[PDB]
Amino acid sequence: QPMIYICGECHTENEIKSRDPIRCRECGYRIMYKKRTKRLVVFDAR
Amino acid sequence: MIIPVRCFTCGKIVGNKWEAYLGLLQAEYTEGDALDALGLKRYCCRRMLLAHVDLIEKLLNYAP
Amino acid sequence: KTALEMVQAAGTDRHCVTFVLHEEDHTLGNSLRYMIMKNPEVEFCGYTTTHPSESKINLRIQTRGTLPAVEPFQRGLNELMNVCQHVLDKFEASIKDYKDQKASRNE
Amino acid sequence: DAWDQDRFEKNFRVDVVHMDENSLEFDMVGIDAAIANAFRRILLAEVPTMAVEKVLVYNNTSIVQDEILAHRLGLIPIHADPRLFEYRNQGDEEGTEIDTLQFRLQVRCTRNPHAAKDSSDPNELYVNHKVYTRHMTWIPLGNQADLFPEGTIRPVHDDILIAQLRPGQEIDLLMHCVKGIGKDHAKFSPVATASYRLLPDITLLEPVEGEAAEELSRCFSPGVIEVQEVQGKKVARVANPRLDTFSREIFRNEKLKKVVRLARVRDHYIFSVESTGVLPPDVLVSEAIKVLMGKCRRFLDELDAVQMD
Amino acid sequence: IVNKASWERGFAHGSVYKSEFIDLSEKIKQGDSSLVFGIKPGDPRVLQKLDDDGLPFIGAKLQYGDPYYSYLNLNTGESFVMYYKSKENCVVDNIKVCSNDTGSGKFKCVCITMRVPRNPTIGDKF
Ligand SMILES: [Zn+2]
Ligand SMILES: [Zn+2]
């Protein structure tokens, strides 16, 4: 899958390839976060 | 933020005494008896539950 | 890998030797200091931790009347085994007297 | 005088006061501070237990941070018998059947579909919104399902609020319980607190009557000094001076600070061991006595290794 | 003197959130300003450390010497790489992708936010 980015306001998983302008494709909002996916990171319980 | 699992000074498990503390306080107990009737005897443990501001109900309002 | 260093004082003087016990603190260093001082053949027995960043103790033992100072230290250890063994045997047989009074009281 | 072993084995006695689950109170007549403190300091730091060390996260979408969640899982008591397990030799990430235990805290929060009318209560709106420790699934590896029955390897308290969730948020981690002593990190200690106190004595050097006995009756703790009627007057007699907090309140009143001699009884310690639940409390005092013997045996083995003679 | 076990149980544990607004035109300017974040396929420097867009993962720990972000010059195809040149160890908390004030900015602004643990050590003043 491509990378998934979440808008700040309406929270839609808008995929952004690195070419097109960056905006939410529903409400046009300009700041978009990034989704957290499965991968392994080891933290110690100390 | 959220209640610590162990008391800081001497490590009594006090993390399992928070919801049953709010339950005693809604049932019109006082805080001198809602810390007595949970088994918190030393004032280093009664410090941990009396003085605790559960700052995660305010923090979860900003939810996606 | 070692756990015990004997340091003679002047090489020939085996009456004064400072036992440097590795991986220790005031748990065994103060229980041994109580037992070696219960020997009349010991003029002086004191311990110190080296530095709290380290975990080894010094343990000075020095005797009178010409004993090498490992014999109050073997007697220092065996007479603590014989104390913890007796504390264990009077503890495990006093818990059982408590359990068998909690059972046979109104049950 | 010297160490008469038959003076010790005649005057020593242990008197157990209270022992329910996860608590113990006993006396020790005739042991000195340098042994009783060794028992106390072996309970707090030498008796080994099991606790979480590594945490392998996938999708901590929660509000509790990835670091703080691992530290919060470290402090949760595991109800595994420590004596069954071994220390990890250093550098193994995946321990064997004998070294490590495993768990898996896999909780996903979702909205409650039904019975969600005009309410803002979280129990009626959300499912799995308070991640308790009863959400931990023991994942036995090797042949550990055969050594322990169904329901032995387990978190102790099963009410400890780990995280708190809202819908869309997920915790999918994996744990690795290890073995350690209570001084390598404080999460391995078996005991809430282990302590002692000398039994106080209180000695009425003067017979006090009347209202001065009631004034004496309230300086000490409730239950120490009792006021009894003997033909019209109210004289005071002590009764169980174990109850006294030793707060020195009688040395504030002026006329009555010279009638009682508040001191302590030497070598009459009153322990109290409160376990966190990993082992029963009278098994933790046994495996704290048996550690000081091991510390003696290791140095006797080293003395046998130095001098062959 | 602070108790050691009490320090180990959670006494005054903290965090410090080093956020860093990264812009590919206010800093990196050589030619034509067509710099978007991206990885060139066949680059071993970004294998499993940076994501397929050139930004690091969320939750991924960073240490001194890790690839920090990578940006793909769109006109030639030659992707670069920038490394995490801080001393401390940190965890990428979230990454926000900022556009311009119109809504038509190209994918070249970002603001990485990093947790740094910062527990009480020797020399921390109370
Ligand atoms: Zn939007
Ligand atoms: Zn406490």
PDB file of N, CA and C in Angstrom, chain A residues 1 3 5 16-23 28-37 39-43 46, chain E residues 36-37 48 51-53 56-61 74 91 94-100 102-107:
ATOM      1  N   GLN A   1       0.844  -1.189   0.000  1.00  0.00           N
ATOM      2  CA  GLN A   1       0.000   0.000   0.000  1.00  0.00           C
ATOM      3  C   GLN A   1       0.883   1.245   0.000  1.00  0.00           C
ATOM      4  N   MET A   3       1.694   5.207   1.430  1.00  0.00           N
ATOM      5  CA  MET A   3       1.654   5.803   2.755  1.00  0.00           C
ATOM      6  C   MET A   3       0.311   6.472   2.984  1.00  0.00           C
ATOM      7  N   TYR A   5      -1.899   9.271   5.211  1.00  0.00           N
ATOM      8  CA  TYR A   5      -1.807  10.496   5.983  1.00  0.00           C
ATOM      9  C   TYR A   5      -3.198  10.894   6.432  1.00  0.00           C
ATOM     10  N   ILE A  16      -0.839  10.341  -0.149  1.00  0.00           N
ATOM     11  CA  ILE A  16      -0.119  11.380  -0.869  1.00  0.00           C
ATOM     12  C   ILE A  16       1.113  10.742  -1.478  1.00  0.00           C
ATOM     13  N   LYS A  17       1.116  10.613  -2.794  1.00  0.00           N
ATOM     14  CA  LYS A  17       2.364  10.379  -3.489  1.00  0.00           C
ATOM     15  C   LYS A  17       3.126  11.695  -3.590  1.00  0.00           C
ATOM     16  N   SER A  18       4.440  11.601  -3.796  1.00  0.00           N
ATOM     17  CA  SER A  18       5.309  12.752  -3.562  1.00  0.00           C
ATOM     18  C   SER A  18       5.257  13.805  -4.669  1.00  0.00           C
ATOM     19  N   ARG A  19       4.250  13.779  -5.539  1.00  0.00           N
ATOM     20  CA  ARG A  19       4.194  14.676  -6.682  1.00  0.00           C
ATOM     21  C   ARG A  19       3.139  15.765  -6.521  1.00  0.00           C
ATOM     22  N   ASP A  20       1.896  15.369  -6.256  1.00  0.00           N
ATOM     23  CA  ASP A  20       0.762  16.279  -6.277  1.00  0.00           C
ATOM     24  C   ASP A  20       0.814  17.248  -5.092  1.00  0.00           C
ATOM     25  N   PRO A  21       0.071  18.359  -5.152  1.00  0.00           N
ATOM     26  CA  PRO A  21      -0.022  19.244  -3.985  1.00  0.00           C
ATOM     27  C   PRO A  21      -0.637  18.561  -2.775  1.00  0.00           C
ATOM     28  N   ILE A  22      -0.190  18.986  -1.598  1.00  0.00           N
ATOM     29  CA  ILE A  22      -0.590  18.365  -0.341  1.00  0.00           C
ATOM     30  C   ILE A  22      -1.751  19.144   0.265  1.00  0.00           C
ATOM     31  N   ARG A  23      -2.873  18.451   0.413  1.00  0.00           N
ATOM     32  CA  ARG A  23      -4.119  18.965   0.950  1.00  0.00           C
ATOM     33  C   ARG A  23      -5.015  17.770   1.200  1.00  0.00           C
ATOM     34  N   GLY A  28      -9.905  20.166   2.108  1.00  0.00           N
ATOM     35  CA  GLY A  28      -8.871  21.087   1.682  1.00  0.00           C
ATOM     36  C   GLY A  28      -7.942  21.600   2.758  1.00  0.00           C
ATOM     37  N   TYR A  29      -7.970  21.013   3.953  1.00  0.00           N
ATOM     38  CA  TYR A  29      -7.132  21.466   5.051  1.00  0.00           C
ATOM     39  C   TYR A  29      -5.670  21.158   4.753  1.00  0.00           C
ATOM     40  N   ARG A  30      -4.781  21.949   5.348  1.00  0.00           N
ATOM     41  CA  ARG A  30      -3.414  22.064   4.873  1.00  0.00           C
ATOM     42  C   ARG A  30      -2.390  21.305   5.697  1.00  0.00           C
ATOM     43  N   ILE A  31      -2.687  20.963   6.946  1.00  0.00           N
ATOM     44  CA  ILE A  31      -1.759  20.238   7.809  1.00  0.00           C
ATOM     45  C   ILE A  31      -2.242  18.807   7.916  1.00  0.00           C
ATOM     46  N   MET A  32      -1.377  17.860   7.575  1.00  0.00           N
ATOM     47  CA  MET A  32      -1.746  16.456   7.529  1.00  0.00           C
ATOM     48  C   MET A  32      -0.710  15.650   8.288  1.00  0.00           C
ATOM     49  N   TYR A  33      -1.170  14.820   9.216  1.00  0.00           N
ATOM     50  CA  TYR A  33      -0.297  14.002  10.045  1.00  0.00           C
ATOM     51  C   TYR A  33       0.095  12.730   9.299  1.00  0.00           C
ATOM     52  N   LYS A  34       0.636  11.760  10.016  1.00  0.00           N
ATOM     53  CA  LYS A  34       1.042  10.508   9.406  1.00  0.00           C
ATOM     54  C   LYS A  34       0.515   9.346  10.237  1.00  0.00           C
ATOM     55  N   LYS A  35       0.139   8.270   9.556  1.00  0.00           N
ATOM     56  CA  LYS A  35      -0.452   7.094  10.170  1.00  0.00           C
ATOM     57  C   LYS A  35       0.648   6.211  10.740  1.00  0.00           C
ATOM     58  N   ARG A  36       0.359   5.547  11.857  1.00  0.00           N
ATOM     59  CA  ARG A  36       1.296   4.607  12.456  1.00  0.00           C
ATOM     60  C   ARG A  36       0.939   3.186  12.035  1.00  0.00           C
ATOM     61  N   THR A  37       1.913   2.456  11.498  1.00  0.00           N
ATOM     62  CA  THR A  37       1.682   1.120  10.974  1.00  0.00           C
ATOM     63  C   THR A  37       2.399   0.067  11.824  1.00  0.00           C
ATOM     64  N   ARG A  39       5.264  -2.199  12.678  1.00  0.00           N
ATOM     65  CA  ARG A  39       6.648  -2.629  12.553  1.00  0.00           C
ATOM     66  C   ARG A  39       7.203  -2.767  13.958  1.00  0.00           C
ATOM     67  N   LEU A  40       8.307  -3.488  14.082  1.00  0.00           N
ATOM     68  CA  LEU A  40       8.795  -3.894  15.391  1.00  0.00           C
ATOM     69  C   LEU A  40       9.803  -2.893  15.927  1.00  0.00           C
ATOM     70  N   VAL A  41       9.533  -2.349  17.111  1.00  0.00           N
ATOM     71  CA  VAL A  41      10.479  -1.509  17.834  1.00  0.00           C
ATOM     72  C   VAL A  41      10.562  -2.019  19.265  1.00  0.00           C
ATOM     73  N   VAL A  42      11.767  -2.331  19.724  1.00  0.00           N
ATOM     74  CA  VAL A  42      11.978  -2.986  21.009  1.00  0.00           C
ATOM     75  C   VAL A  42      12.289  -1.933  22.062  1.00  0.00           C
ATOM     76  N   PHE A  43      11.420  -1.809  23.058  1.00  0.00           N
ATOM     77  CA  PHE A  43      11.648  -0.966  24.221  1.00  0.00           C
ATOM     78  C   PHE A  43      11.830  -1.843  25.444  1.00  0.00           C
ATOM     79  N   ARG A  46      12.548  -0.770  31.730  1.00  0.00           N
ATOM     80  CA  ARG A  46      13.382  -0.318  32.828  1.00  0.00           C
ATOM     81  C   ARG A  46      13.381   1.202  32.904  1.00  0.00           C
TER      82      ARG A  46
ATOM     83  N   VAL E  36      11.155  17.247  -3.499  1.00  0.00           N
ATOM     84  CA  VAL E  36      10.150  16.557  -2.707  1.00  0.00           C
ATOM     85  C   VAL E  36      10.850  15.465  -1.920  1.00  0.00           C
ATOM     86  N   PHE E  37      10.219  15.012  -0.841  1.00  0.00           N
ATOM     87  CA  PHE E  37      10.769  13.894  -0.086  1.00  0.00           C
ATOM     88  C   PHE E  37      10.543  12.601  -0.853  1.00  0.00           C
ATOM     89  N   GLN E  48      14.581  -0.038   5.610  1.00  0.00           N
ATOM     90  CA  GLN E  48      13.856  -0.300   6.857  1.00  0.00           C
ATOM     91  C   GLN E  48      14.011   0.837   7.877  1.00  0.00           C
ATOM     92  N   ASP E  51      10.868   5.455   5.677  1.00  0.00           N
ATOM     93  CA  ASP E  51       9.711   4.875   5.019  1.00  0.00           C
ATOM     94  C   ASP E  51       9.844   5.065   3.505  1.00  0.00           C
ATOM     95  N   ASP E  52       8.855   4.602   2.749  1.00  0.00           N
ATOM     96  CA  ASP E  52       8.899   4.696   1.297  1.00  0.00           C
ATOM     97  C   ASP E  52       8.626   6.101   0.774  1.00  0.00           C
ATOM     98  N   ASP E  53       8.379   7.075   1.648  1.00  0.00           N
ATOM     99  CA  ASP E  53       8.225   8.463   1.245  1.00  0.00           C
ATOM    100  C   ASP E  53       9.434   9.318   1.579  1.00  0.00           C
ATOM    101  N   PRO E  56      10.952   9.359   8.271  1.00  0.00           N
ATOM    102  CA  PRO E  56      11.085   8.183   9.133  1.00  0.00           C
ATOM    103  C   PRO E  56       9.728   7.702   9.619  1.00  0.00           C
ATOM    104  N   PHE E  57       9.735   6.529  10.238  1.00  0.00           N
ATOM    105  CA  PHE E  57       8.500   5.965  10.745  1.00  0.00           C
ATOM    106  C   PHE E  57       8.088   6.680  12.019  1.00  0.00           C
ATOM    107  N   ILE E  58       6.824   6.537  12.387  1.00  0.00           N
ATOM    108  CA  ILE E  58       6.324   7.023  13.663  1.00  0.00           C
ATOM    109  C   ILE E  58       6.457   5.904  14.672  1.00  0.00           C
ATOM    110  N   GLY E  59       7.104   6.195  15.793  1.00  0.00           N
ATOM    111  CA  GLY E  59       7.467   5.187  16.751  1.00  0.00           C
ATOM    112  C   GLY E  59       8.877   4.676  16.607  1.00  0.00           C
ATOM    113  N   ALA E  60       9.519   4.909  15.467  1.00  0.00           N
ATOM    114  CA  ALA E  60      10.868   4.412  15.236  1.00  0.00           C
ATOM    115  C   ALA E  60      11.868   5.199  16.063  1.00  0.00           C
ATOM    116  N   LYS E  61      12.650   4.493  16.872  1.00  0.00           N
ATOM    117  CA  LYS E  61      13.697   5.112  17.666  1.00  0.00           C
ATOM    118  C   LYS E  61      14.786   5.663  16.764  1.00  0.00           C
ATOM    119  N   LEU E  74      13.520  16.112  -8.115  1.00  0.00           N
ATOM    120  CA  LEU E  74      12.560  15.560  -9.056  1.00  0.00           C
ATOM    121  C   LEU E  74      13.040  15.674 -10.493  1.00  0.00           C
ATOM    122  N   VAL E  91      12.663   9.124  20.086  1.00  0.00           N
ATOM    123  CA  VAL E  91      11.635   8.335  19.422  1.00  0.00           C
ATOM    124  C   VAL E  91      10.733   9.282  18.654  1.00  0.00           C
ATOM    125  N   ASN E  94       5.276  12.038  16.351  1.00  0.00           N
ATOM    126  CA  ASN E  94       4.449  12.133  15.158  1.00  0.00           C
ATOM    127  C   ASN E  94       5.138  13.014  14.133  1.00  0.00           C
ATOM    128  N   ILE E  95       4.706  12.876  12.893  1.00  0.00           N
ATOM    129  CA  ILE E  95       5.235  13.634  11.776  1.00  0.00           C
ATOM    130  C   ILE E  95       4.059  14.318  11.113  1.00  0.00           C
ATOM    131  N   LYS E  96       4.100  15.640  11.031  1.00  0.00           N
ATOM    132  CA  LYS E  96       3.034  16.387  10.391  1.00  0.00           C
ATOM    133  C   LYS E  96       3.552  17.013   9.109  1.00  0.00           C
ATOM    134  N   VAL E  97       2.738  16.930   8.069  1.00  0.00           N
ATOM    135  CA  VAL E  97       3.102  17.383   6.738  1.00  0.00           C
ATOM    136  C   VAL E  97       2.391  18.700   6.490  1.00  0.00           C
ATOM    137  N   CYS E  98       3.148  19.785   6.467  1.00  0.00           N
ATOM    138  CA  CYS E  98       2.597  21.123   6.365  1.00  0.00           C
ATOM    139  C   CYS E  98       2.580  21.552   4.909  1.00  0.00           C
ATOM    140  N   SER E  99       1.476  22.145   4.476  1.00  0.00           N
ATOM    141  CA  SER E  99       1.373  22.758   3.161  1.00  0.00           C
ATOM    142  C   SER E  99       1.626  24.258   3.293  1.00  0.00           C
ATOM    143  N   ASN E 100       1.342  25.016   2.237  1.00  0.00           N
ATOM    144  CA  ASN E 100       1.429  26.465   2.324  1.00  0.00           C
ATOM    145  C   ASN E 100       0.062  27.057   2.654  1.00  0.00           C
ATOM    146  N   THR E 102      -1.981  28.708   0.823  1.00  0.00           N
ATOM    147  CA  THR E 102      -3.012  28.555  -0.198  1.00  0.00           C
ATOM    148  C   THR E 102      -3.666  27.186  -0.107  1.00  0.00           C
ATOM    149  N   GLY E 103      -2.862  26.132  -0.129  1.00  0.00           N
ATOM    150  CA  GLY E 103      -3.381  24.783  -0.153  1.00  0.00           C
ATOM    151  C   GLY E 103      -2.849  24.037  -1.351  1.00  0.00           C
ATOM    152  N   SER E 104      -1.912  24.653  -2.066  1.00  0.00           N
ATOM    153  CA  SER E 104      -1.358  24.056  -3.272  1.00  0.00           C
ATOM    154  C   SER E 104       0.151  23.894  -3.192  1.00  0.00           C
ATOM    155  N   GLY E 105       0.710  23.845  -1.988  1.00  0.00           N
ATOM    156  CA  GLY E 105       2.141  23.653  -1.856  1.00  0.00           C
ATOM    157  C   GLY E 105       2.543  22.229  -2.193  1.00  0.00           C
ATOM    158  N   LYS E 106       3.740  22.089  -2.735  1.00  0.00           N
ATOM    159  CA  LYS E 106       4.266  20.781  -3.064  1.00  0.00           C
ATOM    160  C   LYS E 106       4.833  20.140  -1.800  1.00  0.00           C
ATOM    161  N   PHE E 107       4.964  18.813  -1.820  1.00  0.00           N
ATOM    162  CA  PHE E 107       5.330  18.027  -0.640  1.00  0.00           C
ATOM    163  C   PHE E 107       6.799  18.265  -0.305  1.00  0.00           C
TER     164      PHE E 107
END
